[PDB]
């Protein structure tokens, strides 16, 4: 599957040591919603070595129970939220990763339309200003906080000729998500968006011109804590890592 998409157009193999490459990755740190992130999530995102670093051939994003204040808003956890500086329309995205094992964590590999104009993102109003969900969202990988034996694929959008919020997706079983690398992938073209875990299709959504999946998207990588899909965080939580061996994007 996906063999049609054979021209490498963006990648990071994480074979340097230090901060994520600033030519490739933008950090989000400003909260979008009056001091907070969406979905009742409990973290701040920062650009510090506490929450992200590259070593030993892999990127780590690390969530920590840590009191942290940004512009008068205090939260009890810190993490990182990266966006690719690369925006692209159609392609095959492959991310090979190990997911956090701890309860309360909500890792994601996902895209937003580049016209999202989300506060503090890399693209601003360059492509437009289509407030979510009108910019479109593809969730290549999520896990919730309470079931680490399943992965999520999902889509969120509004049709171009409607304000009605649509969302749907699937899930699939996963073994040893935290201790074994798996490859989370998207194959996206004008016909369809297909999300896979290794070779297993998790969900395929037919595309059409009435969707927001025919204009540029960028990639996001993060760990949220708590909130809708993180759920309850044990009192004893200290920290956890989402470890990414590489991101590759083909067209
Ligand atoms: Ca690597």
């Amino acid at each position: 599957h996906g063999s049609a998409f054979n021209t490498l157009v963006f990648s990071d193999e994480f074979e340097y040591e230090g901060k994520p490459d600033p030519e490739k990755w933008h950090y989000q740190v400003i909260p979008p919603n009056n001091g907070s992130w969406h979905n009742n999530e409990l973290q701040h995102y920062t650009n510090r070595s506490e929450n992200s670093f590259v070593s030993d051939g892999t990127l780590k994003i690390r969530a920590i129970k840590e009191k942290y204040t940004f512009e008068g808003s205090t939260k009890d956890y810190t993490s990182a939220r990266l966006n690719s500086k690369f925006a692209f329309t159609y392609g095959k995205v492959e991310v090979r990763a190990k997911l956090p094992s701890k309860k309360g964590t909500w890792p994601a590999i996902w895209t937003l339309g580049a016209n999202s104009n989300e506060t503090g993102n890399y693209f601003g109003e360059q492509y437009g200003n289509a407030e979510w969900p009108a910019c479109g969202e593809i969730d290549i990988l999520e896990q919730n906080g309470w079931d680490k034996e399943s992965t999520i694929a999902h889509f969120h959008w509004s049709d171009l000729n409607s304000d009605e919020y649509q969302n749907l997706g699937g899930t699939t079983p996963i073994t040893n998500a935290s201790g074994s690398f798996h490859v989370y992938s998207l194959e996206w073209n004008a016909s369809a968006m297909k999300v896979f875990l290794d070779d297993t299709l998790v969900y395929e959504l037919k595309n059409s011109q009435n969707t927001p999946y025919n204009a540029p998207h960028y990639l996001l990588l993060n760990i949220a804590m708590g909130g809708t899909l993180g759920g309850d965080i044990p009192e004893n939580f200290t920290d956890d890592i989402f470890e990414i061996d590489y991101v590759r994007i083909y067209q």
Side-chain angles (χ1 to χ4, degrees):
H1 60 90
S3 67
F5 292 104
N6 70 334
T7 296
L8 189 70
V9 291
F10 174 81
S11 66
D12 198 343
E13 297 296 323
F14 296 117
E15 289 164 326
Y16 55 93
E17 176 193 287
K19 306 161 17 229
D21 179 355
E23 288 178 2
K24 293 188 202 274
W25 302 108
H26 176 75
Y27 283 94
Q28 288 189 273
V29 306
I30 299 166
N33 174 35
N34 298 116
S36 299
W37 285 87
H38 299 297
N39 315 303
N40 299 304
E41 289 162 16
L42 299 184
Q43 78 294 145
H44 270 312
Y45 289 121
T46 88
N47 76 158
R48 304 175 299 153
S49 293
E50 270 78 359
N51 303 118
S52 63
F53 53 101
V54 185
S55 63
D56 197 29
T58 64
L59 166 67
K60 286 77 165 179
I61 293 167
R62 173 160 60 205
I64 306 175
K65 188 172 188 173
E66 175 182 1
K67 247 78 140 107
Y68 185 84
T69 301
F70 183 84
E71 291 303 282
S73 170
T74 303
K75 297 292 174 191
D76 293 333
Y77 301 89
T78 56
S79 186
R81 177 167 165 140
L82 301 182
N83 298 351
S84 63
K85 289 188 177 179
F86 177 78
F88 58 105
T89 305
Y90 309 139
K92 172 169 72 183
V93 176
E94 295 175 352
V95 183
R96 181 169 188 249
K98 283 180 186 184
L99 304 185
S101 62
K102 295 183 172 170
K103 187 169 178 182
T105 61
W106 178 5
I109 298 167
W110 56 296
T111 71
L112 283 170
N115 57 355
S116 71
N117 192 36
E118 174 161 285
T119 286
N121 84 344
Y122 182 67
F123 299 100
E125 288 183 282
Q126 292 174 29
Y127 290 101
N129 180 26
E131 184 170 12
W132 190 96
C135 51
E137 170 178 342
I138 299 173
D139 302 311
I140 298 177
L141 174 280
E142 299 177 81
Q143 283 196 307
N144 62 225
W146 56 87
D147 179 6
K148 300 309 194 179
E149 314 304 316
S150 166
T151 70
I152 289 155
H154 220 85
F155 299 81
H156 303 79
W157 77 101
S158 57
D159 282 352
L160 266 52
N161 75 352
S162 146
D163 293 319
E164 196 183 332
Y165 163 52
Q166 321 281 145
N167 89 92
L168 37 70
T171 58
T172 201
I174 186 169
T175 289
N176 201 8
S178 71
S180 184
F181 284 108
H182 291 74
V183 177
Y184 300 94
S185 67
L186 166 69
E187 296 166 15
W188 169 30
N189 58 28
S191 291
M193 283 73 62
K194 297 178 194 181
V195 175
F196 291 90
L197 170 60
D198 298 316
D199 298 321
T200 302
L201 182 77
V202 189
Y203 197 84
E204 167 174 351
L205 175 62
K206 184 177 173 70
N207 201 3
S208 82
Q209 276 292 324
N210 206 204
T211 77
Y213 302 116
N214 299 286
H217 277 51
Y218 59 90
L219 189 70
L220 302 91
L221 299 169
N222 62 289
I223 307 168
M225 292 299 302
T228 298
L229 297 186
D232 291 335
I233 304 163
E235 179 285 338
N236 81 337
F237 184 85
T238 52
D239 48 65
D240 208 6
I241 278 166
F242 179 12
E243 180 178 21
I244 293 166
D245 188 21
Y246 53 73
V247 172
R248 298 170 182 164
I249 306 177
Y250 302 87
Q251 288 178 141

